[PDB]
Design a protein around this ligand. Structure first.
Ligand SMILES: Nc1ncnc2c1ncn2[C@@H]1O[C@H](COP(=O)(O)OP(=O)(O)OP(O)(O)=S)[C@@H](O)[C@H]1O
Ligand SMILES: *CCC(=O)Nc1nn(Cc2ccc(F)cc2)c2c(C)cccc12
Ligand SMILES: [Zn+2]
Length: 401
C-alpha cells in the first residue's frame, strides 16, 4: 500500500481538517485514484464514510457524483462542504439551469443526485465524464432503505455508460448476501471489499431492566430536573416516543419528539434545536440518526430491547463524536423481545431475514450475558481491533460486577 504524499496530506488537512487517513479510508481513496476500482465498504458509524467519496474529487479538482434519495440530508452536506471551501450542490429537475451549466463547466467538486434522476440522465453523466471527468460515483445502501434493490436497479446502466468510472457502494450491514445483491444490482467489476468495524472506547455500555414506570426508569439519569448532557432516548414506536415525551414534560425537561411520521419542518426544527442546545433531549425512533451533526451527544438510552446486535452497534456509534466520555444504556423487559420478532416478518429478502435472525439471537445473548459487553461486540472484528478500556470502570456494567 503506497503511502499518501505531502500534496495528499496537505489537501486532507486544509479541506477536511484531518492530519491523517484511517487505514480503510486510504485503501478506498487510493483504490479509486490509482486503480479506478469499484468498492463495497461495510461502514461502522463514526468511522468516517464521507471522506471516502468526498476526498478523491476534491484532491484532483474534478467531480464526484453522490447518489441518494435523501435530498434534505444531502443539502446539509452541501452547506458543510461550503464551510470548508468545497463547492458542492444538489442537482435535480427543480434545480435551475444556471447550476446545471456550472456543473458542466466543472465548478462543483461534489454533485448530489437521486437514483431516479440518475436513471433518465445517463447522457449527461457521459458528457460530464467526457468534459471534466468523474473521479467516482458513490451510493450508500443505508440511504435507499424504505429496499435498496429497487433504487440500485435504476443504477444498472451506470457501468455500461461509464465503464471507466469506479463506483464506491457503502453499506451499514456486514451481511454477505446484501454485499452480493449490491455487486449484482450495480454490476461491479472485481470490487475491493472492506470492513471498518472498530471499538468506540469513549462509550460506556450498560444493560438494565424496566421497572414498569417511565419516570422510575429515567430518574437515575436526571440530576429544576435535567439530564447530565445532550441525550437521545430511542423508542421502538412513534406512540412510545409521545408517552416518554409526556412523562419527561411533567418535570419541565427540555424535550423534543422525533419520528418519521412528523412533517419536514417539525422534524427539522427538533433537529436544529438539539444542535443549538435549545432542547437537551430528543425522544426518538431510529428515524433520527443519519447526519445529526452534533458532536457532544453524551447519552444514548435505548428504551426497549434493541431489535438486533448489528443495528444496536450502528445506533450507539452516533454518540460521542467529540471523543469525550459517553454512555449507552439499554432499558429492556422480556415482553419487548416478543414484539421485536414481529419486525423480522416484514423483512422481504429471505437471505437477509436469516442474517437479522442471527443478529437478534446475538442481541438476546448480549442482554442476558455476564461477560464484558465490549468483548461480545468486538467478537465480530479482526483481533487487532482495546485491552486498555476493557476491564476498567469505563468499559461496561459487567466489568464493574
Ligand atoms: N481521517 C479522519 N481522522 C479523524 N477523524 C475522522 C477522519 N475521517 C472521519 N473522521 C470523523 O469521523 C466522524 C464520522 O464521519 P462520517 O462517517 O463521515 O460521518 P457522517 O457521514 O456524518 O455520518 P452519520 O450520518 O453521522 S452516521 C466525523 O466526526 C469525522 O470528522
Ligand atoms: C470485516 C470485519 C468487520 O468489520 N465486520 C463487521 N461486522 N459487522 C456486523 C456487526 C458488528 C458488531 C456487532 F456487535 C454486531 C454486528 C459490522 C458492522 C455493523 C459495520 C462495519 C463492519 C462490520
Ligand atoms: Zn467490559
Amino acid at each position: 500500500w503506497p503511502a499518501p504524499n505531502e500534496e495528499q496530506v496537505t489537501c486532507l488537512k486544509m479541506y477536511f481538517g484531518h492530519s491523517s487517513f484511517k487505514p480503510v479510508q486510504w485503501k478506498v481513496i487510493h483504490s479509486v485514484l490509482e486503480e479506478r476500482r469499484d468498492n463495497v465498504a461495510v461502514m461502522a458509524t463514526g468511522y468516517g464514510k464521507s471522506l471516502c467519496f468526498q476526498y478523491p474529487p476534491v484532491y484532483v479538482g474534478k467531480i464526484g457524483l453522490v447518489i441518494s434519495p435523501l435530498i434534505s440530508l444531502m443539502e446539509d452536506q452541501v452547506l458543510q462542504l461550503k464551510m470548508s471551501n468545497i463547492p458542492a450542490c444538489f442537482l435535480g429537475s427543480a434545480q435551475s439551469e444556471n447550476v446545471l451549466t456550472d456543473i458542466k463547466l466543472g465548478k462543483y467538486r461534489i454533485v448530489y443526485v437521486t437514483p431516479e434522476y440518475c436513471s433518465g440522465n445517463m447522457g449527461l453523466l457521459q458528457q460530464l465524464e467526457a468534459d471534466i471527468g468523474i473521479t467516482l460515483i458513490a451510493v450508500d445502501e443505508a440511504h435507499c432503505i424504505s429496499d435498496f434493490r429497487d433504487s440500485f436497479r435504476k443504477l444498472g446502466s451506470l457501468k455500461t455508460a461509464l465503464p471507466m468510472v469506479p463506483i464506491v457502494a457503502l453499506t451499514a450491514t456486514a451481511s454477505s448476501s446484501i454485499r452480493e445483491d449490491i455487486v449484482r444490482c450495480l454490476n461491479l467489476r472485481n470490487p475491493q471489499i472492506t470492513c471498518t468495524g472498530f471499538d468506540r472506547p469513549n462509550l460506556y455500555l450498560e444493560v438494565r431492566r424496566k421497572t414498569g414506570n417511565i419516570l422510575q426508569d429515567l430518574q437515575p439519569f436526571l440530576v429544576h430536573w435535567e439530564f447530565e448532557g445532550p441525550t437521545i432516548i430511542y423508542c421502538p414506536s412513534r406512540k412510545m416516543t409521545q408517552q416518554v415525551t409526556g412523562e419527561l414534560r411533567k418535570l419541565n425537561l427540555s424535550c423534543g419528539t422525533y419520528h418519521a411520521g412528523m412533517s419536514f419542518s417539525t422534524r427539522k426544527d427538533i433537529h436544529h434545536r438539539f444542535v443549538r442546545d435549545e432542547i437537551q433531549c430528543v425522544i426518538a425512533t431510529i428515524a433520527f440518526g443519519m447526519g445529526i451533526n452534533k458532536a457532544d451527544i453524551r447519552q444514548v438510552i435505548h428504551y426497549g430491547a434493541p431489535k438486533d446486535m448489528e443495528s444496536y452497534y450502528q445506533e450507539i456509534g452516533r454518540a460521542g463524536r467529540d471523543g469525550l466520555q459517553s454512555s449507552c444504556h439499554v432499558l429492556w423487559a422480556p415482553a419487548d423481545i416478543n414484539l421485536n420478532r414481529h419486525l423480522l416478518t416484514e423483512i422481504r429478502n429471505e437471505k437477509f431475514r436469516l442474517y437479522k435472525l442471527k443478529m437478534m439471537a446475538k442481541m438476546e445473548k448480549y442482554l442476558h450475558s455476564s461477560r464484558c459487553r465490549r468483548q461480545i461486540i468486538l467478537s465480530h472484528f479482526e483481533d487487532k481491533q482495546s485491552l486498555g478500556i476493557m476491564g476498567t470502570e469505563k468499559c461496561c456494567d459487567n466489568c464493574r460486577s
